[PDB]
Design an enzyme around this catalytic site. Sequence first.
Site, PDB file in Angstrom:
ATOM      1  N   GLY A 246      42.590  42.413   2.015  1.00  0.00           N
ATOM      2  CA  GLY A 246      43.178  41.662   0.913  1.00  0.00           C
ATOM      3  C   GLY A 246      43.782  42.567  -0.167  1.00  0.00           C
ATOM      4  O   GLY A 246      44.354  43.636   0.137  1.00  0.00           O
ATOM      5  N   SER A 247      43.583  42.196  -1.400  1.00  0.00           N
ATOM      6  CA  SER A 247      44.258  42.820  -2.570  1.00  0.00           C
ATOM      7  C   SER A 247      43.903  44.283  -2.692  1.00  0.00           C
ATOM      8  O   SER A 247      44.635  45.041  -3.327  1.00  0.00           O
ATOM      9  CB  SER A 247      43.923  42.148  -3.847  1.00  0.00           C
ATOM     10  OG  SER A 247      44.288  40.818  -3.814  1.00  0.00           O
ATOM     11  N   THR A 248      42.791  44.763  -2.097  1.00  0.00           N
ATOM     12  CA  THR A 248      42.451  46.195  -2.187  1.00  0.00           C
ATOM     13  C   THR A 248      43.511  47.122  -1.564  1.00  0.00           C
ATOM     14  O   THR A 248      43.432  48.345  -1.785  1.00  0.00           O
ATOM     15  CB  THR A 248      41.052  46.457  -1.612  1.00  0.00           C
ATOM     16  OG1 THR A 248      41.042  46.166  -0.208  1.00  0.00           O
ATOM     17  CG2 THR A 248      40.014  45.712  -2.407  1.00  0.00           C
TER      18      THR A 248
END
Length: 493
Positions: A246-248
């Site tokens: 995801g956003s990482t």
Amino acid sequence: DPARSVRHIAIPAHRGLITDRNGEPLAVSTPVTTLWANPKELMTAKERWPQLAAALGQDTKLFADRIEQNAEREFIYLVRGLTPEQGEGVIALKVPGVYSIEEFRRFYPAGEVVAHAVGFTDVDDRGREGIELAFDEWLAGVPGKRQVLKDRRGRVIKDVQVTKNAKPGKTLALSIDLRLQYLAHRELRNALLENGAKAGSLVIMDVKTGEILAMTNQPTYNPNNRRNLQPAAMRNRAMIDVFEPGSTVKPFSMSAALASGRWKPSDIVDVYPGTLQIGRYTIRDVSRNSRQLDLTGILIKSSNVGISKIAFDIGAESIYSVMQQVGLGQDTGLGFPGERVGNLPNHRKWPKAETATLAYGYGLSVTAIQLAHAYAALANDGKSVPLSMTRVDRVPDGVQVISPEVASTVQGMLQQVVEAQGGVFRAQVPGYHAAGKSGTARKVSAYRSLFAGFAPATDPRIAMVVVIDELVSAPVFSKVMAGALRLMNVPPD
């Protein structure tokens, strides 16, 4: 059958000491005594059997039944791995047909704290999990060889000679700092129990050296007492659990954007109204309260629309290339038994949907160790250093995978994600400036709370990944990073 025969018996070797990077013992070979019997001889001393059985902790009739039904054999094990005191007690009964072999069994002084990283040995003193398996040849040394003379009935008449001296195994110093490992274990456990979560992992890396300074999984187990052991507990989650990050990984998408020539931090993207139609697909943002965002705001808001518009402009190939170069979905080279690679899919033609999902982190799957290694490269001014579970004295050259200028810019953006109004205030590290990104990971075979970051923000030393199975990860990062920096005497910035 001949009156005499020259036979050979193996001489177990002393397994190598495992220590932490400071010389603290983690796995230590402890002398034990194994007892073997010639049933043909034991059958001549039946009135002694109940005393022998009692000294071995075996049932009287089960012991007798075992000898009787093996009467035809010249070798059986009576018991493996007594204390040397207990072994001398049984030898002191002088029961005919009973002999001893000096062996070694492991003791794990830090127990459950470092269970997954160190692993354990099987009944034969062979590595079964963790470093014990990965460095088995280094640690095991070489069994010796003894000549014995036996008669027609298998009685050992005399020990003739050693033909092969055993070679002890070699000492191994891990990269792990047991002080940081204790801190990581305590804070992850406390966070799971207070948040009612069942499982998670925490990895701490030295960004300069590639060293894994801590690696903790929950649940854990005591390697000294594996009766009652649940298989769930033995799972080395940091190396085996594969998830969409995801956003990482948006910082890697942004690194590609800044390397393209087409984007600078002050650039603006219009993300209104929080959705983007691409053919039959809709990209949806988690928060839909924005119009213009600069590139740092696209990271602070974790806007999928914002990162997708950038990705369409620069192309998926640029993003793919950064993610591959920082090791995502790639072999780590650590040689742990279960270790998974995950998946960074490639395409000749990248349609908009696949470009977008890669850019916002749902188009690949990684492990926590891969994600930490990628953060370490970004933290180390864009230079990747190979992962190590052993103490590093001579640091490898490593590879410049992101330009130092782009890495410095992205470090400053991630500092703002933690510190800026609207940011991940719960990741702020007492006494320091930190940098990082949260994400909601999707399990690949379920959700995980992720936090990935590094500190200090302006001169980074440590990278960390926190994974909590089904936000809650940020305060664990905060507490463990604070303690880790102080234990390593990193000057507060």
